[PDB]
Symmetry: none
């Protein structure tokens, strides 16, 4: 199944066990709009998008989804929530909340 861009920023986001605010401060992005960013409400810019992956915490998830190619050789792999790559099990998880 194909996952929208926003989804490519949610699965990994939850993999770090952080919140929109946590990352919002790591990059300096506005939380008020971030809610719609990771939600896919509107395709965000490139200057900001990269500012989210450029982070050292989300460094392992740069092109792992951008091109569907995991590069573990350097430390790039797919998280648990991600329904694409893995390194232990499926881990489908159960979605909740509404936003």
């Amino acid at each position: 199944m194909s996952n929208t861009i926003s989804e490519k920023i949610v699965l990994m986001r939850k993999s770090e066990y952080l919140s929109r605010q946590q990352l919002a401060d790591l990059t300096g992005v506005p939380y008020g709009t971030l809610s719609y960013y990771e939600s896919g409400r509107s395709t965000p810019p490139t200057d900001v998008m990269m500012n989210i992956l450029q982070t050292p915490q989300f460094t392992k998830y740069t092109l792992w989804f951008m091109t569907n190619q995991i590069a573990p050789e350097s430390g790039q792999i797919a998280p648990a929530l991600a329904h694409f790559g893995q390194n232990e099990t499926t881990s489908p998880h159960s979605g909740q909340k509404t936003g």
Copy 2:
């Protein structure tokens, strides 16, 4: 000096010996708009930006600039025009037991 997001798609692009029209047809992106994309006229979306790097020709140039980190261990490096390649990922330590 610092390179612009658009320049990140120009230096490498010209490295493949191809014009905007070439890639525009390889990714399906319209040349009429691409002209402004690589030009930096307006920050492009995330669905298209990735559609340009996802290509097999521009697979090595995924995060090589997105985070200023070349991952040759997997097959990612900087082109000739790029002339870039640097980063800083410090990771100090701490801890004590006084009281």
